[PDB]
């Protein structure tokens, strides 16, 4: 999930826009 | 674009700049 | 409600948003 | 006081609410 | 003023806050 | 840099201030 990519990992602006609606 | 750990209220910012007018969903744990 | 920590500036937003017109007093050590 | 019970400890809604004026 | 350890969006808008019209630069590493 | 005055370490608001233009 988002946390776990983007919080305790680090997420590439692409990676963020897959949670996007 | 920062890459950097993006937590908690932070994230929600970036997702509501990133998304735009499409919106988002935050679905922690 | 969120159940995290919460600290410095987050902290006051949790309080002024949660207090409404009551608001509230930060008094750290 | 608040740091020690909410920034480092957890507080819930309950205990916020107890530095509302 | 705060006495605390200041980073990414937080370092940002203590600058914003305390440099006022003047602006300011924020360059990190 | 600002990062390693201020953020790794504690910035005075004058130290602060040498980042404003
Ligand atoms: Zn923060």
Redesign the interface.
Same mark, same amino acid.
Not at chain 1, 1 to 4: F, M
Not at chain 1, 6 to 13: E, G, P, R, Y
């Given at each position: 999930?988002?946390? *776990?990519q983007? +919080?305790? $990992?680090? +997420? $590439? @602006?692409y990676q @963020? *826009?897959n949670?996007?609606? | 674009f920062v890459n950097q750990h993006l937590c908690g209220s932070h994230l929600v910012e970036a997702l509501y700049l990133v998304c735009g007018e499409r919106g988002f969903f935050y679905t922690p744990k």
């Open positions: 999930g988002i946390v *776990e983007c +919080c305790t $990992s680090i +997420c $590439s @602006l @963020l *826009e949670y996007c609606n | -």
